[PDB]
Amino acid sequence: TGLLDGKRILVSGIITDSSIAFHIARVAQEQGAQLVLTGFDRLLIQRITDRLPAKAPLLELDVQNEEHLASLAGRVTEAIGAGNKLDGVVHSIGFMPQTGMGINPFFDAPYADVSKGIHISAYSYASMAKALLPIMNPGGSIVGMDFDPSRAMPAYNWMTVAKSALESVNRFVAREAGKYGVRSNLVAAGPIRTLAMSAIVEGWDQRAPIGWNMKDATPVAKTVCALLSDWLPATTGDIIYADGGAHTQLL
Amino acid sequence: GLLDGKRILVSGIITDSSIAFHIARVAQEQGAQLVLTGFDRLRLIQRITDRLPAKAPLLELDVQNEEHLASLAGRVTEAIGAGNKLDGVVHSIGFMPQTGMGINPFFDAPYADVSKGIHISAYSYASMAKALLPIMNPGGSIVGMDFDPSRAMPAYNWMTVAKSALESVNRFVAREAGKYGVRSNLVAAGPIRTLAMSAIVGGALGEEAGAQIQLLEEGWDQRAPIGWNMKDATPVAKTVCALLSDWLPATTGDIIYADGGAHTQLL
Amino acid sequence: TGLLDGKRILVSGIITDSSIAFHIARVAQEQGAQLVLTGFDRLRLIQRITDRLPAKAPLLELDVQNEEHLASLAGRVTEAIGAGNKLDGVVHSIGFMPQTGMGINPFFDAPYADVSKGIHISAYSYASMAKALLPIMNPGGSIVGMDFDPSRAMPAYNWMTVAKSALESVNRFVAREAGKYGVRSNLVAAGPIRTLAMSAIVGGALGEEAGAQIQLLEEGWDQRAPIGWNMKDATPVAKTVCALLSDWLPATTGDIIYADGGAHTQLL
Amino acid sequence: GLLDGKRILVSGIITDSSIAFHIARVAQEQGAQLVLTGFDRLRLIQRITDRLPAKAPLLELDVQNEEHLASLAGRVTEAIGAGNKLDGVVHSIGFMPQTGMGINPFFDAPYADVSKGIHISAYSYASMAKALLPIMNPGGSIVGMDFDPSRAMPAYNWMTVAKSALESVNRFVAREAGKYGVRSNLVAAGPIRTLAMSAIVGGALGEEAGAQIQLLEEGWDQRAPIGWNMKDATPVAKTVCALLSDWLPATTGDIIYADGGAHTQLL
Ligand SMILES: NC(=O)c1ccc[n+]([C@@H]2O[C@H](COP(=O)([O-])OP(=O)(O)OC[C@H]3O[C@@H](n4cnc5c(N)ncnc54)[C@H](O)[C@@H]3O)[C@@H](O)[C@H]2O)c1
Ligand SMILES: NC(=O)c1ccc[n+]([C@@H]2O[C@H](COP(=O)([O-])OP(=O)(O)OC[C@H]3O[C@@H](n4cnc5c(N)ncnc54)[C@H](O)[C@@H]3O)[C@@H](O)[C@H]2O)c1
Ligand SMILES: NC(=O)c1ccc[n+]([C@@H]2O[C@H](COP(=O)([O-])OP(=O)(O)OC[C@H]3O[C@@H](n4cnc5c(N)ncnc54)[C@H](O)[C@@H]3O)[C@@H](O)[C@H]2O)c1
C-alpha cells in the first residue's frame, strides 16, 4: 504493498461522511496507513469515524484552545505508543462566521468575526505544526486544505483572505518543518459539497480540461495521500492544485 | 501638476522618513490638496507635517478604534469643506508586535499578537475604504503599501502573512470600490529605511540585524536591473502618485511593483 | 505641463486609426512628446493614417523580420530626431500569428514554421528592437511592449498565447540589458480592444463563430472588471503606456502592468 | 509497484546522469513497462539504457524530424504490441544553441538559433502529444520537464524564454489531452548535474562556468527548506512517477515543483 504502508498519520477535520477529511482518512487506511483522528465539539464523530475501514483513536482538538495544543503531542504519543512518531499530519480545518461570507456585505464583517476566521483557518496551521513537529519522523509530511484565493470572487469573501493568509503561513511552516526533514504543502481543491459548503457557504467542470465532479472527494483525497507518501519528496512550502486543471484556464 | 485639483487623504506619517511623508510631499508638489491622518503621537506628527511644502489639516485615526472610523468621513468633510469629496486615499499603515518579527521564532508569536498585526496591517485597508468610499468622487483611487509576500523570507515572518491577507483584501475592496467608479491598488515597494524598518524590523532582528539587513540591501540592489537605494523613498512616492493620478485608469485590484524590478529577477 | 514634455519617443505598430499604437501616439503627442513612427509593409496607407495625428511625425520602415531594417534603424531614427539627440521612449506595439495557430483551427495542426514566424514577430522582435535602439536611448528612458495575459489557456488565442508567454520572458531579460543604460522595460497587458488584428487575425480564424465570439468576450471581460471595460475604447490603454513612458514609474522594470479593468484579479 | 503494469514512453536519455534515465530507472522499479526514445547517437544510447534495471525497446526520435514524428505512434505500437496503448509519456528533452546561452550576450542570438531551441524545447511537447495521444489510454499522463522561468536569471537566457513557452504549450496540451481522458503536466525541477548542464550551459558560460555551477549547487540548497542535492536525480524522478501514477487524478495543465521548495523562498 500500500502507498502509505507502515505510516502513522494524524488526520483532523472530520465532521460528516462528506468531509474531505473523512475521504482522506479512508483512502489513507486503504493504502496501509495507521491513523489517529481529531475532532471538534460533537465527539457524533466517533460514529462517523466508525464508518472508516479501520478503527483509529479519536482525540479531541480545538485549534483555538492553547491547552489542547499543548497536550496534543503527548495525547498522540499515548495512542500510537511511546517511542513511535508521526510520518504524516493532515490539516483539514476551516471556519468563518456567517458575517464574512455569502451575501453579507464585505465591509460589514466585524474584525472579531474575521480574526476568529483567520485564527481557525490560517493560524491553526502554524500551531498544529508547532505541537506535532517534535514527534514527527524525517521524510514526514504536513498537508493542509486550500481554495485558490489568488483572485477575488463572490461569496467566498473573507474566507478568501484567510486562505491567502494560509498560503503565506504554509511557506513559513516549511522553513520550520525542514529542520526535521519534514515537508509542508497545501492541496488546493475545487468545490466539494461538504457540511461547510452548504452550512456556511457548472463553471468549474467547464474550465477543467479533465472535468470536475463536485460530488466526489476521492480525487482530492488521493492527491493528499500522494503528498503524504514518499513520492513527492522534493516539494515543500508549495501548493498542489487538485481542481481538474480549472485554475489554469481562463474559459 | 500631476495631481492638480485632487483632494487626497494620506495616512501613515510618523516621521519624515515615512513613505507616507514622501507620498504627501510629492503629491503636494504636484498640486494635490491633502488631508492627513496620524496615529497616537499627534503633537509630534503635527511638527513633522508642518515641514511639508504646504499646510494640511491633520486628523486623528487609530484604525483599531471603531469610533475614529465612524466619524472619519464627517471629520474629513469638515476639513475639505461642505460639498467637497475625496479623489484619493493613501493607506500607508502597518504594525506587527516584536514576537511576530525578526529572529523571534515563528511558532512563538501568540495569536493575539498576530491578530492585532493583521487588524492594523490588512483589515484596516477594508476599514478605511468602508469609511471613505461614501465620500469619494467617481474616477477616484485608493492605494495601499505592500511588500511582496508571495515568497517567505527571514525576519518579515508574520508581517508576510499579513501582507498576503492585504493583497486578498485589496481585490475585494476593488469590487466594492467599483460601484463608486473608484480604483483600488497596492504599491509593493522594495526596502526603505523608515521608523518601521528601524524600530520594528531591526529591533526584532537583534544581533543578526546588521548582517541580515546588509544582505537584504546588497541583494536587492543586485537583483534590481535599475538598482535600488534603501535611503531614497521618492521613487516609491512617485509611483503612488501615478496611481492617484488619471494615468492608470484601467487598473484595479492590482499590485504595482516599485522595487527596481527585483521581484522579476531570480538573481 | 505635458506628462511627456520634451521626450523623444519611437512608436511602432500603427496600421489603422483603431491601432492601440495610434491612440498611444495621439495621447503621447497631446502630452508634449516628439514622436518617431515606424511601420510595416503598407507604408503609404500608414502615412495617410498618421496624417490624422496632432502633429506630422517622421515614418520609417521597419519589418522586424528584416535584418537590414533592424541593423540600420538607429541610424535612421537618429537622422529623424537630429544628430546628438537620443530617444527617451520606445513602444513595441507589434504582433502577428498565421491563421493556422489561431481561432478554431486545431492547436496541434499548426506547423512549426507558422508558430515560429509568430514568435519571431510577436516575441523575439521585442529583444531585436531593444538591441537596435538601446544605444540611442537616454537614461531614465522606457521601453514598453503590448501584452495579453497568457498565464492561463483560453480558446481562440491559441499559439498567440504561447508567443505572449515568450514575450513576458523576453521582457524580463530585456530589463537586464536595459538596466545598463539606465532604461526601464515593461509590458502593458491590455484587455480586448477592437483593432485590425482583432477583426482580421482573431475574428477571421473564428469563422462564423466570431461575432458573439467577440461580443461575448466584450461582456465577459466587462462583467469581471470591477471598474468595467470598453473594448471600443483604446484610450485607457494608451494613457497607461504613456504613464510608463513618463518619469512617474521610475522604479518599475521587467514587469507587467495590467490595463484590463482589473478583470485578471477577479475570478467570477 | 506504483506503476505496476503501466506502459510508458520515456524520451530524453543520453547519459546515465540524464533526468530521463533516472525517471526510467524508478519507473522500472515500480513495475512499469517502458519504451525509450533517443536522438542522434543511438548505438551509444542503447549502451546507456543497457544499465537500466530491465529491458526496454529503444526508438530513434529527432523531434525536429517530421517523418520521425509521423511514424512514432506506429513504431511504439510495434514495440508494445497491437491493440495495446500507452498510459504514460515523458518528454525530457531540451536544446538551445550556444549563442542563446551562458555569457554570450542575450541580444546576439540570431532568431534561427532561438527558434531551433524553441522548436526542440517547447514546440516538441505539443508535437509529441499530437503523435502519442491517439494511442493513449484514459487515465493516462503526459509529463514534461521544466525549469521555473517566471523570473529572469544569469546564464539560462533564451532557454528561459523557451521554458516560458513550454508552460503555455502545456496548458493548451491539457485541453487536447482531456478529450482522451489524459492529464498533461510539467515538473519544474531544481538544478541537476547532467550533460546539458555541463556541455551546453557550462559550455556557454566559458571561464565563469565553475563559479556559476558552484553557486547553483549551494545556493539552491540553502534556499530549499528541505535541502537540495544537485547530484541526485531520484526525487525529481520520483515526482515524475507520481504524476504518471493514478495518485494525482485531478491535476492537469499544471506545474509541480520538485526543487526542494526553493521557489517558495526568497532567501
Ligand atoms: N468543501 C470544498 O469544496 C472545499 C474546497 C477547497 C478547500 N476546502 C477546505 O478543506 C478543508 C475541510 O473542510 P470540508 O470541505 O471538508 O467541509 P467540513 O465541513 O468537513 O470542514 C469543516 C471542519 O473544520 C473543523 N473545525 C472547525 N472549527 C474548528 C476548531 N476551532 N478547531 C478544530 N477543528 C475545527 C470542523 O469540526 C470540521 O470537521 C477546509 O480548510 C476547507 O476550507 C474545502
Ligand atoms: N519601509 C519599507 O521598506 C517598506 C517596504 C514596503 C512596504 N512598506 C509598508 O508601507 C507602510 C508604511 O510603513 P513605513 O516604511 O513608511 O514605516 P512608518 O513607521 O513611517 O509608517 C508606518 C505607519 O503605521 C502607522 N500605524 C501603526 N498602527 C496604527 C494604527 N493602529 N492606526 C493608524 N496607523 C497606525 C504608524 O503610526 C506609521 O505612521 C506599511 O504598510 C509598511 O508595511 C514599507
Ligand atoms: N486588440 C487587443 O485586444 C489587444 C489586447 C492586448 C495586447 N494587444 C497587442 O497590442 C499590439 C498591437 O495590436 P493591435 O490590437 O493594436 O492591432 P493592430 O493590427 O492595429 O496592430 C498590429 C501591428 O503589428 C504590426 N506588424 C505585424 N508584422 C510586423 C512585422 N513583421 N514587422 C513590423 N511590424 C509588424 C502590423 O503592421 C500592425 O501595425 C500587439 O502586440 C497585440 O498583441 C492587442
Ligand SMILES: NC(=O)c1ccc[n+]([C@@H]2O[C@H](COP(=O)([O-])OP(=O)(O)OC[C@H]3O[C@@H](n4cnc5c(N)ncnc54)[C@H](O)[C@@H]3O)[C@@H](O)[C@H]2O)c1
Ligand atoms: N539538469 C537540470 O538542472 C534541469 C533542471 C530542470 C529541468 N531540466 C530539463 O530536463 C530535461 C532533460 O534535460 P537533462 O538535465 O536531463 O540534460 P540531458 O543532456 O541528460 O538530456 C537532454 C536531452 O534532450 C535530448 N534532445 C536534444 N535534442 C533533441 C531532438 N532534436 N529530438 C529528441 N531529443 C532531443 C537529448 O538527446 C538528451 O537526451 C529538459 O527539458 C531540461 O531543460 C533540467
